[PDB]
Design an enzyme around this catalytic site. Structure first.
Site, PDB file in Angstrom:
ATOM      1  N   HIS A  19       1.053  -0.853   0.224  1.00  0.00           N
ATOM      2  CA  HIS A  19      -0.229  -0.274   0.053  1.00  0.00           C
ATOM      3  C   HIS A  19       1.023   0.840  -0.307  1.00  0.00           C
ATOM      4  O   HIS A  19       0.712   2.579  -0.296  1.00  0.00           O
ATOM      5  CB  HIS A  19      -0.965   0.076   1.492  1.00  0.00           C
ATOM      6  CG  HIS A  19      -0.587   0.322   2.724  1.00  0.00           C
ATOM      7  ND1 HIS A  19      -0.700  -0.951   3.701  1.00  0.00           N
ATOM      8  CD2 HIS A  19       0.660   1.102   2.725  1.00  0.00           C
ATOM      9  CE1 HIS A  19      -0.303  -0.781   4.653  1.00  0.00           C
ATOM     10  NE2 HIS A  19       0.185   1.037   4.317  1.00  0.00           N
ATOM     11  N   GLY A  79       1.722   5.427   9.951  1.00  0.00           N
ATOM     12  CA  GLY A  79       3.327   5.487   9.123  1.00  0.00           C
ATOM     13  C   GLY A  79       3.407   4.333  10.056  1.00  0.00           C
ATOM     14  O   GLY A  79       5.466   4.305   9.761  1.00  0.00           O
ATOM     15  N   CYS A 131       3.694   1.640   9.404  1.00  0.00           N
ATOM     16  CA  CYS A 131       3.535   0.287   8.634  1.00  0.00           C
ATOM     17  C   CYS A 131       4.619  -0.190   8.384  1.00  0.00           C
ATOM     18  O   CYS A 131       5.040   0.991   7.890  1.00  0.00           O
ATOM     19  CB  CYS A 131       2.652   0.658   6.844  1.00  0.00           C
ATOM     20  SG  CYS A 131       0.618   1.463   8.092  1.00  0.00           S
TER      21      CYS A 131
HETATM   22  C1  LIG Z   1       1.344   3.097   7.428  1.00  0.00           C
HETATM   23  C2  LIG Z   1      -0.151   3.537   6.569  1.00  0.00           C
HETATM   24  C3  LIG Z   1      -1.433   4.276   7.981  1.00  0.00           C
HETATM   25  O1  LIG Z   1      -0.652   4.120   9.078  1.00  0.00           O
HETATM   26  N1  LIG Z   1      -2.347   3.449   8.295  1.00  0.00           N
HETATM   27  C4  LIG Z   1      -3.164   3.184   6.290  1.00  0.00           C
HETATM   28  C5  LIG Z   1      -2.589   1.461   5.815  1.00  0.00           C
HETATM   29  C6  LIG Z   1      -3.445   1.103   4.859  1.00  0.00           C
HETATM   30  C7  LIG Z   1      -4.074   2.205   3.876  1.00  0.00           C
HETATM   31  C8  LIG Z   1      -5.231   1.986   2.805  1.00  0.00           C
HETATM   32  C9  LIG Z   1      -5.272   0.620   3.336  1.00  0.00           C
HETATM   33  O2  LIG Z   1      -4.350   1.223   2.112  1.00  0.00           O
HETATM   34  C10 LIG Z   1      -4.057   1.953   0.847  1.00  0.00           C
HETATM   35  C11 LIG Z   1      -4.013   3.367   4.658  1.00  0.00           C
HETATM   36  C12 LIG Z   1      -3.652   3.917   5.869  1.00  0.00           C
HETATM   37  C13 LIG Z   1      -3.097   3.489   9.142  1.00  0.00           C
HETATM   38  C14 LIG Z   1      -4.229   2.503   8.737  1.00  0.00           C
HETATM   39  O3  LIG Z   1      -4.557   1.415   8.556  1.00  0.00           O
HETATM   40  N2  LIG Z   1      -5.580   3.627   8.604  1.00  0.00           N
HETATM   41  C15 LIG Z   1      -6.786   3.133   8.446  1.00  0.00           C
HETATM   42  C16 LIG Z   1      -8.447   3.070   9.946  1.00  0.00           C
HETATM   43  C17 LIG Z   1      -8.957   3.003   9.297  1.00  0.00           C
HETATM   44  C18 LIG Z   1     -10.242   2.189   8.371  1.00  0.00           C
HETATM   45  O4  LIG Z   1     -10.849   2.419   9.086  1.00  0.00           O
HETATM   46  C19 LIG Z   1     -11.950   1.385   7.413  1.00  0.00           C
HETATM   47  C20 LIG Z   1      -8.954   2.625   7.232  1.00  0.00           C
HETATM   48  C21 LIG Z   1      -7.577   2.569   7.540  1.00  0.00           C
HETATM   49  C22 LIG Z   1      -6.947   2.746   6.089  1.00  0.00           C
HETATM   50  C23 LIG Z   1      -2.618   3.134  10.066  1.00  0.00           C
HETATM   51  C24 LIG Z   1      -3.245   4.030  11.519  1.00  0.00           C
HETATM   52  C25 LIG Z   1      -2.554   3.424  12.342  1.00  0.00           C
HETATM   53  C26 LIG Z   1      -1.788   2.274  12.322  1.00  0.00           C
HETATM   54  N3  LIG Z   1      -1.722   1.139  11.872  1.00  0.00           N
HETATM   55  C27 LIG Z   1      -2.683   2.097  10.063  1.00  0.00           C
END
Ligand SMILES: *CCC(=O)N(c1ccc([C@H](C)OC)cc1)[C@@H](C(=O)Nc1ccc(OC)cc1C)c1cccnc1
Ligand SMILES: *CCC(=O)N(c1ccc([C@H](C)OC)cc1)[C@@H](C(=O)Nc1ccc(OC)cc1C)c1cccnc1
EC number: 3.4.19.12
Lengths: 304, 304
Positions: free
Chosen positions: B41, B143, B145
């Site tokens: 991602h 961040g 991930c």
């Molecule tokens: C590393 C990026 C990140 O922190 N997060 C993230 C991960 C994946 C994506 C998408 C799925 O891929 C393009 C975007 C951002 C956070 C995350 O998972 N955020 C998140 C929270 C809740 C929901 O509900 C639908 C969706 C998403 C994408 C993240 C935050 C804190 C800890 N770990 C991950």
């Protein structure tokens, strides 16, 4: 999101752990620059631990009696001295992995990571706090002496604790890196009772702020209190008195969450008077007191 | 004595953390040999996270679009591929700090240490468990991930998890190092509910053995039970069914303490039916399920 009992990365401290042997006793040492720090009880004969006179015992030891082993290679001891309850073994080689470091003596309530070691090898890392009775509720077995407690600010390791002994109550006593024990403990096999283990109020307050930040809000109430009112309740429940310094230190968490410190004190006061009622806060069924306000901000903001 | 939620020393894994940037997204990567592993991602545009087609998105990226930075020095990307939900960035340099390693896919109930990282820098280390619903109750922020979960047997790091995402319920989802997610989670911003978070019964039993070893014995009762009887009680309390394999695995702890596994099950059955009654076990007011029988033996014996 999520709140874990997090420890500092241990790599910088792993690069300093050595094995120290004197006679037949083997414990851990901390190798920083050309000096190896270890508890002075390494020189004790296992059948003179009741009443040791370390100055006298030390006269029978020479540089060649202290065997220092970093990994599988032996270090040459060119000098030895006793500073309070630690021995400083000057070696002929500076530790090539010596990080940027400081020796700090912490106050009760302050937290730190411990790298538990056996025979100079690290086996685990965990978070601790210097209890208000100057003990630490660690996880140490025989041969863990010389394991250290530390904090890290970016690239600088502040060494705050070295493990010396287990009190009969299963709690732990040790020194700062200058060899001075925390509390009234002595490095001798004697009747040493720990004092009252009071709860670190400012840390519980900080962990309630961490809970609010992470979604657990059921405990937030409609009440407020004063420092004197809260302190009467805290006294009854063997909690540390809350000072204006603690309120100031909780300021950034109060600001981030919009919850005034004294309102959180009233929330805590109700939790003390009524209990959790089968509920949990950050996956815990009791009020956690081993996260400082600094640790909460660090964890919640991601300070690397 | 003492029982802490202990993590493996993180040094070996710290030496593998790099920063991976693609466009304007920055996450962590794991550098082992000449390959950098990171969540796929990283290639997503922050305004196409709802429905990404990773194969299509990847066509627009070249080796030069992935910026890999180890410390303050840049690594040269000579190749890139997608394996399940991870990207493997072949670099021109083998990581000089690559420890002995394996990629393992763990089962629910198994525990591991996580080195939380932000921008390729480790900020903390903590112990985790793969929940029976294939989530992990981690501590990760935006961040984080690319942070990994691991176990260590002497000098070999078994990488078991890489952090990919946070579910709306504040819990965490990720993959093994082959890019296959634990559970049914997908790397897309969609409605993904976690299943029932059942308690890992074998781990609670192991932690009751750790409590007996460390002095906490008030919960030991005069009763015994059978696997089927205990399982009826466990079912009611959303506990994992106890199998004969779990009994065998608990064998060494049963032997060390002299308490038959089924007697400890009856002790657990009474704790479930009656609660703690305001009491604590190893400083906890709830039944801890994130210590495997292996972790208890390791901690209680001092495996380095
Ligand atoms: C590393 C990026 C990140 O922190 N997060 C993230 C991960 C994946 C994506 C998408 C799925 O891929 C393009 C975007 C951002 C956070 C995350 O998972 N955020 C998140 C929270 C809740 C929901 O509900 C639908 C969706 C998403 C994408 C993240 C935050 C804190 C800890 N770990 C991950
Ligand atoms: C490193 C040696 C060790 O494990 N212990 C130890 C420490 C200090 C001495 C004496 C004081 O100095 C010559 C001997 C052994 C353990 C320890 O402290 N043992 C101990 C337990 C209880 C009492 O009650 C009076 C006295 C002693 C000495 C130790 C075990 C486990 C964890 N940490 C230390």
């Amino acid at each position: 999101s999520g709140f874990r009992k997090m420890a500092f990365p241990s790599g910088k401290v792993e690069g300093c752990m050595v094995q120290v042997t004197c006679g037949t006793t083997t414990l851990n040492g901390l190798w920083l620059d050309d000096v190896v720090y270890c508890p002075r009880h390494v020189i004790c004969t296992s059948e003179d631990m009741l009443n040791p006179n370390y100055e006298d015992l030390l006269i029978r030891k020479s540089n060649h009696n202290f065997l220092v082993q970093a990994g599988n290679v032996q270090l040459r001891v060119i000098g030895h001295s006793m500073q309070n309850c630690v021995l400083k073994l000057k070696v002929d080689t500076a530790n090539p992995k010596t990080p940027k470091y400081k020796f700090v003596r912490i106050q009760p309530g302050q937290t730190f990571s411990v790298l538990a070691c056996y025979n100079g090898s690290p086996s685990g890392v965990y978070q601790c706090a210097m209890r208000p009775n100057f003990t630490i509720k660690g996880s140490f077995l025989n041969g863990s002496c010389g394991s250290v407690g530390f904090n890290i600010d970016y690239d600088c390791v502040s060494f705050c604790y070295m493990h010396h002994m287990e009190l009969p109550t299963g709690v732990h006593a040790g020194t700062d890196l200058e060899g001075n024990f925390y509390g009234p403990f002595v490095d001798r096999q004697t009747a040493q009772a720990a004092g009252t283990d009071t709860t670190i109020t400012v840390n519980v307050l900080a962990w309630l702020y961490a809970a609010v930040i992470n979604g657990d809000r059921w405990f937030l109430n409609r009440f407020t209190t004063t420092l004197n009112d809260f302190n009467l309740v805290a006294m009854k429940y063997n909690y540390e008195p809350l000072t204006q310094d603690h309120v100031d230190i909780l300021g950034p968490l109060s600001a981030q969450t919009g919850i005034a410190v004294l309102d959180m004190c009233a929330s805590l006061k109700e939790l003390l008077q009524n209990g959790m009622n089968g509920r949990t806060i950050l996956g815990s069924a009791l009020l956690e007191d081993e996260f400082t306000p600094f640790d909460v901000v660090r964890q919640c903001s991601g300070v690397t």
